[PDB]
């Protein structure tokens, strides 16, 4: 397995295009009918930063949970004692550029549990192999992953 390079995205097209994660349909807020489509991921082998102390980062689409859960396994296999960590997931409060897939519960920013930045290129490759529809080595501090809508 080859790490992603800095600022590399896979597939090599923009996130919201048909070959990647596809179109932004619209913001999901806590009242939405579409809010019911989000369910929480309480996998004990995934660390959630929970920046806002709401548990919001755990709420995500079905596809997102599936890929995230696959990645959790491969991370632990790659580096014994290390776990997948999510820094940001569903955003209810506009902490992104508009039309962010975080507003739809279809995108996570991730690290390893140990915050070892040298692992993140490999973590990105693991995310691709776990079946995330778009993976972007967005910064030294995290990888951005998203999935197609249900």
């Amino acid at each position: 397995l080859t790490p992603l390079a800095y600022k590399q995205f896979i597939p090599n097209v923009a996130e919201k295009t048909l070959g990647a994660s596809g179109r932004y349909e619209g913001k999901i807020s806590r009242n939405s009918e579409r809010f019911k489509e989000l369910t929480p991921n309480y996998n004990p082998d995934i660390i959630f930063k929970d920046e806002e102390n709401t548990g919001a980062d755990r709420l995500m689409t079905q596809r997102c949970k599936d890929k995230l859960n696959a990645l959790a396994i491969s991370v632990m296999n790659q580096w014994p004692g290390v776990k997948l960590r999510v820094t940001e997931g569903w955003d209810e409060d506009g902490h992104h550029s508009e039309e962010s897939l975080h507003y739809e519960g279809r995108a996570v920013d991730i690290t390893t549990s140990d915050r070892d930045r040298s692992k993140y290129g490999m973590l990105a490759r693991l995310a691709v192999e776990a079946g995330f529809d778009w993976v972007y080595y967005e910064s030294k501090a995290h990888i951005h992953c998203s999935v197609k809508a249900e």
Partner: antibody
Amino acid sequence: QVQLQQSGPELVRPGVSVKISCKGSGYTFIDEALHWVKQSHAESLEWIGVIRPYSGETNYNQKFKDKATMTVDISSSTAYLELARLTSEDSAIYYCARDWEAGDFFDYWGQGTLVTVSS
Amino acid sequence: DIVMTQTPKFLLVSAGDKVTITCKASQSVSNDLTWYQQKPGQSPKLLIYYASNRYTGVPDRFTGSGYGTDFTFTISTVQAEDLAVYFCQQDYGSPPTFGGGTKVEIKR
């Protein structure tokens, strides 16, 4: 509400050290990197270094390697910057500032501590 | 260490007019370019990161562009409250380094 509260302005003699403080509230202190930045006439803004409370890792700008020491007290949610062997070139405002793990840039800043080196 | 050259040093502009500030890095820094605003007496406030992404709550009139060495910060329709020094910062290289700033003054 995230807040970084720094210690007050300091008059300090040349050759002496000064220790300044930055207390974080309104978020989980240990979770985020804390950076220190110097603002002077001479050089506008300069990054001094970063401390990662969760690991105790420190990274210094080589230019401040022999000048600056960064520590933290988790129990009081306070980061400290010690500047040793002060000369007039150390007179400046010193800020602490946090990142939010999007990259090494800073949403929340302290109010700044003015350090005047003088006899 | 990467050097950030910011121009112009000073701008005079009427409320409603456009502001264009440039920062050039001494080597390519990807899109790892942050723009801050420092009003008088105050600490810097982050407006744009990754060259073009607005921070939470930052008004639409602020934009940024560029990838590599050459970056552009724009205030589309400058408001009275926008008087400040603006600074860029790169964090592609270590250490992070900042530009020397652009002071934006209002004509009335």
